[PDB]
Design a protein around this nucleic acid. Structure first.
Lengths: 329, 915
RNA sequence: GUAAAUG
DNA sequence: GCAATTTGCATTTACCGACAATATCAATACT
DNA sequence: AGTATTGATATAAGTAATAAATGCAAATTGC
């Protein structure tokens, strides 16, 4: 076990940089019970955990106190938060590492030529039983860092070349709404389709019960999130905080072409497919009208499509010879 | 053929007049050809190419560009005809009730009249012209201006037929019409293309839309690009035949059309505005009212005389510059021929930062050299094409009044070489006065203007062999001319003096050089006359004196003493800079100071004029700021009446910006008690030009269009004013208006006399013969302009124009004087049922003056019986001294600062007024 | 946005 | 009344890391 | 009532954010 940071200790701090946290062991153990992480990890004691933006570190302390993994690493740059973490975890198996996870140069330096952390590599058959990461990106300022982190799975250029690894992701609740929306819902976008393509999600927590109307009702029925009081995030000014559980899945398509088609189709996310296809390239509308067989899709909204239909559209785009170069950039 | 040489070779005045008339008639047609718009030539060329292809019967892809454009025009004309028919079916209906239609007719009235046939020419030409104009190649442009450019092109096109006989279209309407036209073109923009099918690995033949609409993300924002087919890019790259509709702007060949109205004047086949109003409806409205009333006729006359100067290009200087040009080496002014941007070595962190700095510096040097070389290219091609021609320049005013040439590429407002390549077309008898004045002109060209007249003439006499050599061997000789400060002007005038010395009698010589009669700190010379300050006038060479007392030299002496004291106290930079304080930099700073220059601009100027001196080689800013911090203090400590007058003007600007209307705010502006300032500083020049400052807060709003919603700033919409900008802009605006008034009065008087007067703001140019007459005219016009109290006239005009205006001020409620206003608002509160509203207070105050508006007796008596909140404040003599709770205050403008005792009739006898 | 020119 | 916050005279030309951003969606104002 | 209008939030994702440094402090408006 490790000393959990107390509410009095977190009270003395001033510079949270806009990051909202939690300080509730009861809420965290309820979240862990809902997660049921031990089901996927047959042997948890060999897990290697690489925590990003640990901030307060209470979540990391709970995780370690619950599971006792093998190797545990924390990545931070903020001066005051790093002072707090270093002052609170001397000698503990917590490995306190000062780097800024915003730069891929940090990962490229940490992976092999320094051997800071050694991620056991697995194939794409089964979700990794060794490597694991938990990220807290509640800081509303840096939210597209999540989009980069999520397209990294598709490009396979990040660690996600090491197998299928969960990344528990503390997110601003509005960003969780944007990611987790279903077709026909206001918050569906490129986040949502990238989520459906490259992973699967289970919402595990949320602060304010009022915004649950934004989520899908059937999804809520399936999930049963561990709701907690909004008086539990230390910076009360910030928006409510949600958690997502993403597990990468096997996929069969071309990532760059898929990105092109989805990104240039979701700009016009209300005008139906009978008109929006022109944005992909010259003659795309007429050609895809000629070729698409499922005429229901032709009237279904771009916000009413799913990942399978987007993969179908990508396949037709590839079959298209007049395909302009996707490196048009 | 050399028209200038022929005219020079003709000695007789009668045949010279006949030659001038014949060349005017002959060049009429050349001017029309040069100014023709390519809206019909492109269509005829495309039709001719299509006819040729049809008659030949053989398909050629390389020549098919014009045929393809003809096909697009054919496929696009009926659809615009259909849209026009929709318009004329919509608007012409008798019933004006909106029945919930899904149509917009705001643009419909816009394109109703003629926009049927000449339009597809504009859309095709502009969209092709912007190949990668907006760095959208990753091909294509940005839709934001692509729609507006079509609207702007239509704007000029509509004015083209009007001048052949809805003043300004809103940017919303421009964007709407552009977007509808571009979408219509996109529908029928088809081109043949070949591609390989990965199923078959064989060429596939068909058609594709030439222009495909798309959106591109840059740093998190939809851009709405408008891309172009790659095959079309390839075809357009090879041909290199732009055939743009709008020809560029070049110096005229026929005598320009004299200004008569605010809208007509200058080019014979183009629309030009008397004001360079960037984007504002109020300036246009007031200028139109002034034109209709007829109170700037003297301004028209001044512009006419300033623009009726014929010029030509100096052949010998052109030959010399062409020789050094074709040599293309690193020369004093022309940059030279550069081959490649050398790459600094790329290190595999301090070394990396040094490499980055070197890369940035080398890239900046590359950009600077390329830009300078391109300018020089255009200027020299224009000069080469214009040799031996008459060059009339029609002039034009910015919103303040300063006169500018219409053609922006080749003009005497340019740099030294551009000025040198120009000489007066006319020739006039030189004589003793001309000889002395031209020698003085060279002397002051060499930078020795701070010395008396006889000393200048002695200097010019002394360097006689130097002039002889520098004109005999333009290059590889002594090259004494390059030692000057105005190289090419010095070269031309040296040429002329060398020819004169080679001539036995200087009197018989016929001159063409422009002689420079400039002024030192015209802004200071206008503060002196405005404030009546005798000390300022005797500081700025306004009172007569045997020797000229140079303001720049005086301030240089003062800052030299200041930095000597600094070196005594122990500043290392001051010690380094003790012996290297330059009249040039101190002159530039002092001269810009009267122009309301900012601290950043002034330190940039000192850095710019210090870098060639190389006191500090690269880091020019760090020493320039240190120099500024002392130089502003010195200038302020020397100048007092000027500072007081500009402080009065700025304070008045603030109190006008924070004002509130009466009639406009009587109707609720929907913001409740919090008001919206909407009044701009407005006055009339001594000439009569309405000078409306344009500064305002403009925020962009998305406008719905068929393609997309373009995000543009609409100036036609009413916006609030920018108090900071208006206050910072009032003093220089007023002073520059006064300079322009002096300029135009002097030009009008010179034209009445019968001279040739070309002027660059304060500096005035004329032949060496008539310098004396021009100086007399200058002095008389200046004294006539400033023989009355302009600042007092300005203040009383402010009082007249802004009489019924109510400022806003937050006095303390606990003040015992609040009792009357509290009673008035309480009765209003009882009627209102809540806290008294400023809108209701303004309505009651307006009702008070409304009764007095009617001369009817009962209206006045009851109006005299009315009591308002403002009437309480009318009893205090010093409201500013009396001045929390927001309350209405009447508009109070401070009285003018005390005037000195100065005599313009005394300044008249100052020979060194304008040297 | 950057750079140069002019008063 | 205070306090921290934003940015400055006029025009002209050329250039590029690069420029006025656009689409829903809700809250409210109009006939 | 019921369309019409305006204000706000997301969009991509390396032209990052936070707070630590600086500024020209002076004229400005944040509250």
């Amino acid at each position: 076990s490790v000393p959990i940071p107390g509410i009095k200790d977190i009270s003395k701090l001033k510079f949270f940089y806009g990051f909202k946290y939690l300080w509730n062991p009861t809420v965290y153990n309820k979240i862990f019970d809902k997660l049921d992480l031990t089901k996927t990890y047959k042997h948890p004691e060999e897990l290697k955990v690489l925590d990003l933006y640990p901030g307060v570190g209470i979540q990391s302390a709970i995780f370690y106190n619950k599971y006792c993994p093998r190797q545990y690493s924390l990545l931070e740059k903020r001066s005051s938060l790093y002072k707090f973490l270093n002052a609170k975890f001397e000698g503990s198996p917590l490995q306190i590492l000062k780097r800024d996870p915003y730069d891929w140069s940090t990962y490229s330096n940490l992976i092999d030529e320094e051997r800071i952390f050694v991620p056991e590599v697995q194939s794409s058959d089964h979700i990794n039983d060794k490597f694991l990461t938990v990220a807290n990106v509640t800081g509303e300022g840096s939210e597209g860092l999540i989009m980069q982190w999520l397209s990294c799975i598709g490009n396979k250029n990040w660690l996600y070349r090491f197998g299928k690894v969960k990344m528990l992701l503390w997110m601003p609740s509005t960003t969780a709404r944007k990611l987790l929306a279903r077709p026909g819902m206001h918050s569906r976008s490129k986040c949502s389709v990238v989520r459906e393509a490259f992973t699967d999600t289970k919402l595990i927590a949320i602060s304010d019960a009022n915004e649950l109307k934004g989520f899908d009702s059937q999804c809520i029925e399936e999930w049963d999130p561990i709701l907690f009081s909004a008086a539990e995030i230390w910076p009360t000014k910030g928006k409510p905080i949600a958690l997502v559980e993403m597990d990468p899945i096997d996929f069969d398509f071309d990532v760059d072409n898929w990105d092109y088609v989805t990104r240039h189709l979701m700009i016009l996310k209300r005008t139906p497919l009978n008109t929006v296809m022109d944005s992909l390239g010259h003659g795309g509308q007429q050609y895809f009208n000629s070729r698409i067989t499922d005429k229901d899709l032709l009237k279904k909204c771009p916000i009413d499509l799913t990942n399978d239909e987007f993969i179908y559209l990508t396949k037709l785009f590839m079959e298209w010879p007049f395909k302009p170069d996707i490196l048009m950039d | 053929i050399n028209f200038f040489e022929i005219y020079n070779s003709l000695p007789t005045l009668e045949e010279k007049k006949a030659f001038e008339s014949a060349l005017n008639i002959f060049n009429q047609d050349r001017q029309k050809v040069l100014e023709n718009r390519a809206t019909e030539a492109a269509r005829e060329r495309w039709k001719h190419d299509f006819e040729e292809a049809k008659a030949r019967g053989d398909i050629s892809i390389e020549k098919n560009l014009n045929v393809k454009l003809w096909k697009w025009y054919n496929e696009m004309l009926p659809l615009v005809k259909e849209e026009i028919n929709h318009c004329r079916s919509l608007l012409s209906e008798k019933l004006s009730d909106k029945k919930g239609l899904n149509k917009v007719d705001t643009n419909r009235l816009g394109y109703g009249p003629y926009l049927t046939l000449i339009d597809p020419g504009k859309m095709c030409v502009i969209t092709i012209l912007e190949l990668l104009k907006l760095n959208s190649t990753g091909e294509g442009m940005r839709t934001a201006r692509a729609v507006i450019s079509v609207g702007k092109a239509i704007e000029m096109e509509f004015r083209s037929e009007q001048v052949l006989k809805k003043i300004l279209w809103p940017q919303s309407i421009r964007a709407r019409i552009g977007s509808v036209l571009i979408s219509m073109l996109i529908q029928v923009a088809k081109v043949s293309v070949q591609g390989v099918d990965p199923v078959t690995k064989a060429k596939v033949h068909g058609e594709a839309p030439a222009f495909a609409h798309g959106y591109q993300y840059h740093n998190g924002s939809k851009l709405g690009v408008l891309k172009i087919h790659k095959t079309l890019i390839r075809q357009l790259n090879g041909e290199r035949l732009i055939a743009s509709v709008q020809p560029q702007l070049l110096p005229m060949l026929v005598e320009p059309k004299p200004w008569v109205n605010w809208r007509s004047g200058g080019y014979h086949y183009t629309q030009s505005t008397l004001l360079r109003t960037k984007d504002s409806p109020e300036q246009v409205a007031y200028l139109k009212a002034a034109s209709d009333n007829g109170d700037i006729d003297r301004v028209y006359d001044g512009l006419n005389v300033l623009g009726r100067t014929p010029w030509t290009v100096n052949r010998k200087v052109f030959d010399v510059v062409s020789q050094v040009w074709n040599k293309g080496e690193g020369f004093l002014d022309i940059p030279g021929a550069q081959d490649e941007m050398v790459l600094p070595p790329a290190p595999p962190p301090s070394i990396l930062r040094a490499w980055k700095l070197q890369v940035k510096t080398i890239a900046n040097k590359f950009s600077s050299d390329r830009s300078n070389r391109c300018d020089t290219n255009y200027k020299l091609e224009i000069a080469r094409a214009f040799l031996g021609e008459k060059l009339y320049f029609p002039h034009n005013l910015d919103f303040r009044g300063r006169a500018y040439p219409l053609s922006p590429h080749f003009n005497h407002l340019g740099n030294d070489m551009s000025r040198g390549l120009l000489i007066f077309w006319h020739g006039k008898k030189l004589g003793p006065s001309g000889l002395k004045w031209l020698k003085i002109h060279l002397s002051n060209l060499f930078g020795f203007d701070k010395l008396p007249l006889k000393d200048r003439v002695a200097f010019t006499e002394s360097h006689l062999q130097d002039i002889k050599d520098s004109a005999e061997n333009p290059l590889t000789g002594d090259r004494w001319w390059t030692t000057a400060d105005k190289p090419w002007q010095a070269l031309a005038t040296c040429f002329e003096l060398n020819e004169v010395m080679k001539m036995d009698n200087p009197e018989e010589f016929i001159s063409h050089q422009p002689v420079h009669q400039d002024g030192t700190c015209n802004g200071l010379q206008h503060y002196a006359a405005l404030g009546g300050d005798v000390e300022g006038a005797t500081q700025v060479n306004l009172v007569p004196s045997d020797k000229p007392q140079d303001v720049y030299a005086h301030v240089a002496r003062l800052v030299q003493k200041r930095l000597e004291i600094a070196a005594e106290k122990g500043d290392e930079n001051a010690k380094i800079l003790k012996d290297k304080i330059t009249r040039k930099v101190v002159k530039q700073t002092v001269m810009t100071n009267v122009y309301g220059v900012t601290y950043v601009g002034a330190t940039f100027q000192i850095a710019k004029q210090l870098s060639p001196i190389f006191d500090d080689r690269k880091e020019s800013l760090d020493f320039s700021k240190y120099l500024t911090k002392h130089v502003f203090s010195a200038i302020r400590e020397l100048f007092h009446s000027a500072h007081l007058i500009q402080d009065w003007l700025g304070e008045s600007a603030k109190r006008i910006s924070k004002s509130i209307r009466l009639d406009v705010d009587e109707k609720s502006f929907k913001n409740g008690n919090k008001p919206d300032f909407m009044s701009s500083v407005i006055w009339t020049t001594p000439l009569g030009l309405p000078i409306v400052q344009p500064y305002r807060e403009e925020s962009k709003k998305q406008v719905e269009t068929n393609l997309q919603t373009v995000f543009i700033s609409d100036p036609f919409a009413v916006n609030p004013v920018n108090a900071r900008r208006q206050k910072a802009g009032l003093p220089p605006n007023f002073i520059h208006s006064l300079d322009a008034s002096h300029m135009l009065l002097s030009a009008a008087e010179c034209g009445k006399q019968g001279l040739d007067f070309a002027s660059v703001h304060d500096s005035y140019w004329t032949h060496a013969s008539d310098i004396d007459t021009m100086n007399v005219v200058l002095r008389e016009q200046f004294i006539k302009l400033h023989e009355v109290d302009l600042v007092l006239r300005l203040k009383e005009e402010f009082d007249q124009r802004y009489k019924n205006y109510v400022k806003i001020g937050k006095l303390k409620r606990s003040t015992d004087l609040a009792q009357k206003i509290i009673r008035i608002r309480k009765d209003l509160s009882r009627k209102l049922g809540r806290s008294t509203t400023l809108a209701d207070e303004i309505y009651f105050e307006k009702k008070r003056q409304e009764l007095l508006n009617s001369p009817l007796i009962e209206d006045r008596n009851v109006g005299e019986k009315m009591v308002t909140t403002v009437s309480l404040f009318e009893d205090i003599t010093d409201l500013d001294a009396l001045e929390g709770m927001s309350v209405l205050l009447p508009l109070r403008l401070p009285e003018i600062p005390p005037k000195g005792d100065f005599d313009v009739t005394v300044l008249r006898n100052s020979q060194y007024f304008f040297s």
